[PDB]
Design a protein around this ligand. Structure first.
Ligand SMILES: [Cl-]
Ligand SMILES: [Cl-]
Ligand SMILES: [Cl-]
Lengths: 402, 400
C-alpha cells in the first residue's frame, strides 16, 4: 500500500524564542480514534523551545512513530540537553513517544501537566514525577515566562494550553485533519482548502463538547495571541483569530445560505424515489443540497456526514422501517449526530410506514429529544402516493428559512 | 460490457420445472447494510403443466428487463396463467409489474393474507388470491399445497409444496454465487454453507425462534427437493440444509471456537487481547478475531456469521465519552438483535472517566441470553497480567 516513509518536517519557525516544529504526516491511519474515516490523513505536531539554560519539549508523536520522533529530535538538539517536557494533553496521539523520549534523555527532567494530566500519565505509562500546574499559573523557565491555561473538555478533562510570549501551544485546540502542503497559514488557497477539514475534526473529535469550545475561546481571548501552534494540522502565525472564529462558528452552527443536508437509506428504491423528488424540489427553489445515501451499492462515511451538519441551514432525513425499529446504519448515523452535532436547526422527516412493534422507538422520537426542530413528517408510500406532499414539505421548509 | 450471469435450466422433468437465476455481482450491501462481497443470487421458477404455466417468484427490480428476456426464452409470457408470490420483498417481487405488463392479460396471483396487503402497498396490485395455511389447490393437473411460515423474515412468508418439491423463497437461501446450480458437489456445498450461516443471521436472525417453528411445521411433509429464492438448489440432500438452518438457530457450538471482538484505539486493548488470544491458543482453542483499529474495520456481517457456532465470546472495550467505543456499541447492538444466544462471555474493559449515566457493555447485555462470566480491567501500567490468565481459565472450566 505505502511506497514511502511518512513525511517528516523539522523546521525553525521562530527566532525569538527559538522554536522548532517537529511534524509527522500520518498517511497510514485510516480511522481516527478507530472510528472517523480520514483518507486525507492527520499530522502530529510537537515543538522544541531552545532557551537560555533550558530546552523545552512540547508534546510528542503517536507511539508507532517513537523511533522516528527520537531521530528527528536528535537532529535539532542533543536529547541529553532537554530539561523540561510540557504535556498539554496526554492522549497517546501526542504522548505515545514520551516513554522512548524519557529513556533517550537518560536523566530526570521536569514534566509539566495538568492535575488530570498527571493522573493519566501515571495510568498510561507509570510516569510518577510530574509537576502539576494550575489554571493561570506562570513559570519562569530559561529566562522566559510560560503561562498555563486550563481548557477542559477539549476534548478530555486534562487539556490545557501553554502560552509563551504571545505564542500559544494548544495541542488539540485549533487542530484539523489533512496533511497541508506547507507548515503555516501564509497562503490563502491552502487555508481555504484546509478549513473544511478543520470542521470535520471539530465535529468528530470535539463535537460532543462543542459548548466547551465557546467557553475556551472566551478564556483564550483575554491573552495576547500572536500565533497558534496546534498538535495537528496547520500552524497559524499570521491570523490565529481566523482559526478561533472558525472554531466558534462551527460550535455555534452558523449556517451557509442555501445549504441543506439530505441523509437517507433506501433498501429497495422507494425512499430513493421520494428523495430524488425532494432534492429536485430543493434545487428548483434555489437550495444547494448535499446528499448522503445508504443504498445496496453505496455507503457514505459518517465523518463526512458529520462535517456537513454545522453549516447546514436544515437537514432532511429519509428513513426505512426495519424489524421493530429503523435501518441499522440510520440508527448509527442518528446516534452520532445526536452525540456530536446536536444543533437547533429545522428538519424534515420522510419515512416509510412499516409494521414494526409499537414498542420500537421511531427516528422521529429519537430526534424529538434533540435540539433539532422537526417541521413535519411525511409518509413514503409505494403506489398511490400524493407527490404534492413532497412539494408541501419542501415549501414549508423554505418558508421556515425565510 | 460485463453483465450479471443468468442461468436458465430445466431442473425437473415431471413436473417440468425451470430455474431462472441471476447472479447479482453489483450489490455490495444486502438490505443496504450487510457486506456481501461474495454476492447473492435471485432464483425464480417456472412450472409448465398440462393447461397451466405457473411462475414462482421473480427478480429484483433493477433486473426486470433481464427477467422478461430470460422468461421469454422458456415460455411465451402470454401463456402464463398463475404467479405464486411466497414473499413480497422487492428482491423477489420487483420484476412483477413488468411481468404483468408483458403477460398482457389477467393471471391468478396467489399470496398469503399479508402478502396481498403488501402487493397493493408496493405496486397497486389488487387482484390477489389469498391462500390459507395448509390450503391445497389443483392447478394444471397437480396439487399445490401452501404452508404459512411467518416471520422468515416478514409476516407474509409462506412456502409452496408441489409433489415433494418445496419452493421456499428466503427459507433455505444463502449468500454467495455458487459455481453450479445444485448440491451435487461436496466441495461446493462445504464452501457454501458458511455463507448460508451469514445469510441466516443477518436476514433472519432476529426471528431465529421461527426457524425452529417453521422446521417443525414442515416436518410433516416429505421433502425431496428444496428450491429457494437465493443460492443453491438442493435436490440430493435437502435434509442437510434444513439441519444447518436448525443448528444455526439453536447456536450449536463448534468445540474450541471462541470469537474475540474488540476495539483498540492506542494499543492498550490490543496488548491485553494479544495475551488473551495467546492464552486461548495454549489451552487448545481456535479463536476467531475481529479488531476495530485505526487501520482496520471488520464487516459486521462477518462478525455475525461467527456468533452461532462459537462456544463463547470475548469483548475488549474502550470507554469513550459517556459510553463505549461507537463501533463496539453498533456491534453489540447488532449481536443482540440478530444473534441473541445463551452463551458465556468475557468482558475486558478500560476504566474510563465516563459520566456514570452512560451505559456499559454489561448493561447492554443484561436483558439478553448472554451471560458474562467475568469483567476484567485493562490498565496501561502495573496491570496484573495474571488476571487475564484467570479469566481464560475460568472460561475453559465453564465450557467443559
Ligand atoms: Cl426503500
Ligand atoms: Cl486502546
Ligand atoms: Cl449504533
Amino acid at each position: 500500500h505505502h511506497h514511502h516513509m511518512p513525511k517528516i518536517w523539522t523546521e525553525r519557525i521562530f527566532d525569538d524564542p527559538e522554536i522548532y516544529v517537529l511534524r509527522i504526516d500520518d498517511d497510514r491511519i485510516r480511522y481516527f480514534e478507530a472510528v472517523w474515516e480520514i483518507p486525507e490523513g492527520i499530522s502530529y505536531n510537537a515543538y522544541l523551545v531552545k532557551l537560555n539554560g533550558a530546552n523545552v519539549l512540547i508534546d510528542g508523536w503517536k507511539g508507532n512513530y517513537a523511533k522516528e520522533f527520537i531521530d528527528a529530535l536528535s537532529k535539532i538538539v542533543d536529547p541529553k540537553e532537554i530539561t523540561h517536557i510540557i504535556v498539554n494533553h496526554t492522549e497517546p496521539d501526542h504522548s505515545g513517544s514520551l516513554p522512548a523520549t524519557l529513556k533517550t534523555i537518560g536523566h530526570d527532567v521536569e514534566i509539566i501537566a495538568s492535575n488530570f494530566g498527571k493522573r493519566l500519565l501515571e495510568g498510561f505509562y507509570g510516569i510518577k514525577d510530574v509537576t502539576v500546574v494550575k489554571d493561570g499559573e506562570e513559570r519562569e523557565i530559561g529566562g522566559k515566562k510560560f503561562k498555563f491555561v486550563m481548557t477542559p473538555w477539549l476534548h478530555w478533562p486534562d487539556t490545557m494550553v501553554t502560552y509563551l510570549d504571545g505564542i500559544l501551544f494548544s495541542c488539540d485546540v485549533g487542530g484539523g485533519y489533512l496533511l497541508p502542503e506547507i507548515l503555516d497559514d501564509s497562503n490563502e488557497s491552502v487555508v481555504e482548502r484546509y478549513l473544511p477539514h478543520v470542521t470535520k475534526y471539530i465535529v468528530t473529535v470535539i463535537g460532543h463538547y462543542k459548548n466547551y469550545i465557546l467557553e475556551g475561546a472566551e478564556k483564550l481571548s483575554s491573552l495576547k495571541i500572536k500565533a497558534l501552534l496546534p498538535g495537528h494540522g496547520l500552524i497559524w502565525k499570521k491570523d490565529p483569530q481566523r482559526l478561533l472564529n472558525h472554531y466558534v462558528s462551527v460550535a455555534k452552527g452558523d449556517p451557509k445560505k442555501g445549504k441543506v443536508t439530505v441523509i437517507y437509506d433506501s433498501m429497495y428504491g422507494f425512499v430513493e424515489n421520494v428523495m430524488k423528488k425532494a432534492i429536485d424540489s430543493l434545487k428548483e427553489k434555489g437550495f444547494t443540497p448535499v446528499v448522503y445515501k445508504f443504498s445496496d451499492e453505496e455507503r457514505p462515511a459518517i465523518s463526512e456526514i458529520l462535517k456537513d451538519i454545522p453549516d447546514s441551514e436544515a437537514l432532511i432525513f429519509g428513513v426505512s422501517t426495519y424489524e421493530a425499529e429503523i435501518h441499522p446504519l440510520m440508527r448509527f448515523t442518528l446516534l452520532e449526530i445526536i452525540d456530536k452535532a446536536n444543533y437547533e436547526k429545522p428538519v424534515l422527516v420522510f419515512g416509510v410506514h412499516g409494521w414494526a412493534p409499537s414498542a420500537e422507538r421511531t427516528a422521529g422520537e429519537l430526534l424529538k429529544e434533540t435540539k433539532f426542530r422537526i417541521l413535519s413528517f411525511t409518509e413514503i408510500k409505494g403506489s398511490n402516493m400524493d407527490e404534492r406532499k413532497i412539494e408541501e414539505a419542501i415549501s414549508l421548509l423554505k418558508k421556515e428559512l425565510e
